[PDB]
RNA sequence: AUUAAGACAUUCGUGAGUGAUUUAUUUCCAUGAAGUGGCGU
């Protein structure tokens, strides 16, 4: 996590959904000079090929007929996403409004695999969507 | 505030009904209530 006008996050007893989940949160702090990506590119630098764009986070297209059409190959697989609604002055405690959208992601393993050049192409494609690369998605390496 | 929240695998339910420890088997086999007379040729 980055964290700006510093709240320091305490480690306690957290909820993360389904059934009162309970899990225990444990706040390391690191470096400040260091973004988080290129650490999570680094755990999973030992998993890449030059023809290959190995899909680590589940990535959502808009149009997947343009993605095809930019590769060889979609050695792929389809995830769901459907999210809980709630702005500042919500109900909280009444029937949640779910995700007026499921939206189809690919899975976790997911390999995209490109023709001749076109690799700058399809990563343009994928990183157009800052919101979900921020939130976590559409990470590859 | 997160495809969340809420929910005892629980209610009812006799290990119970039918059923002789009964059938077959000689307390029997062998066996003398018997032996001897004694006293003065």
């Not at 999973?44 to 297209?61: E, N």
Request: proline share 2%; with cysteine.
């Amino acid at each position: 996590i980055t964290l700006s006008g510093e709240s320091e996050l305490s480690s306690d007893i957290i909820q993360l959904g389904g059934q009162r989940s309970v899990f225990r949160m444990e706040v390391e702090s690191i470096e400040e000079n260091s973004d988080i990506q290129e650490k999570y590119q680094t755990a999973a630098q030992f998993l890449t090929q030059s023809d290959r764009l190995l899909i680590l986070s589940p990535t959502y297209v808009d149009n997947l007929k343009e993605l095809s059409a930019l590769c060889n190959f979609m050695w792929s697989d389809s995830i769901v996403f459907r999210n809980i609604q709630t702005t500042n002055a919500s109900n909280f405690y009444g029937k949640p409004i779910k995700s007026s959208s499921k939206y189809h992601f690919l899975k976790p393993g997911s390999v995209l695999y490109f023709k001749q050049g076109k690799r700058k192409e399809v990563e343009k494609l994928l990183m157009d969507y800052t919101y979900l690369r921020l939130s976590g998605y559409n990470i590859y390496i």
